[PDB]
């Protein structure tokens, strides 16, 4: 279709806009990680829980490695 | 600070209008924003000043 190519356009825009927001707040989360965080937010997620997971996983790849 | 305050004090003292006392307060601010490194052009100069402030706090170690 054409409006089905207009929806993927509307996702490709936001995934770049949230990338701009990701750099102006100066977080370490890069574009590949953010694409997963958005997908978790789509079903709804506790952001206090998701942030706690990231804060633990980073301390087991800089603490052992 | 002292120079801008001088103008402020004089202009509130002599004036007979409170529209012209909102012109003594305001020019006092406008002097501070121009002489000191606070406005948008002086950001590049302030960027150099930050390195000096860093060098100072380094000596504390």
């Amino acid at each position: 279709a054409a409006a089905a190519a207009a929806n993927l356009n509307a996702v490709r825009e936001t995934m770049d806009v949230l990338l701009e927001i990701s750099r102006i707040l100066n977080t370490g989360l890069d574009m590949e990680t953010l694409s997963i965080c958005v997908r978790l937010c789509e079903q709804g997620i506790n952001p206090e829980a998701l942030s706690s997971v990231i804060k633990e996983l980073r301390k087991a790849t800089e603490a052992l490695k | 600070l002292e120079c801008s305050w001088d103008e402020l004090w004089n202009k509130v003292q002599q004036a007979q209008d409170l529209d012209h006392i909102i012109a003594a307060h305001e020019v006092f601010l406008d002097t501070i924003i121009s002489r000191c490194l606070l406005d948008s052009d002086s950001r590049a100069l302030l960027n150099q000043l930050r390195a000096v402030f860093d060098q100072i706090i380094e000596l504390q170690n």
Binding site: A10, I24, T33, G44, N46, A49, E56, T61 | -
Partner: protein, 107 residues
């Protein structure tokens, strides 16, 4: 997607390792997310917008502080995200403040 297989992609993103290497970290990830999946706090994308505003004012990056309003506007204009509050809360939580320099919009 399903949430359980989607939790695997994040643990391969943060760790440099595969999921067939370690299973303790992935166990902890699924354990906490499956036990708190619905938020324990209420939605406010408005106050989370104002706390990104207060942060960009705190940096004296006030040109980007009015640029955030337009990017936050674009996020609402497309609206492909169910909870726009959560991801901004997330980028807000991991924020870093040097209290120095400006940044360009890069177009």
């Amino acid at each position: 997607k399903s949430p359980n297989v989607l939790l695997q992609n994040l643990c391969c993103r943060i760790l440099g390792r595969s999921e067939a290497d370690v299973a303790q970290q992935f166990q902890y990830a699924v354990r906490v997310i499956g036990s708190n999946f619905a938020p324990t706090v209420e939605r406010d994308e408005f106050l989370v917008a104002e706390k990104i505003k207060k942060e960009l004012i705190r940096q004296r990056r006030e040109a980007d502080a009015a640029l955030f309003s337009e990017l936050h506007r674009k996020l609402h204009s497309q609206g492909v995200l169910k909870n726009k509050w959560s991801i901004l809360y997330l980028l807000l939580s991991l924020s870093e403040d040097p209290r120095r320099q400006p940044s360009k919009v890069s177009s």
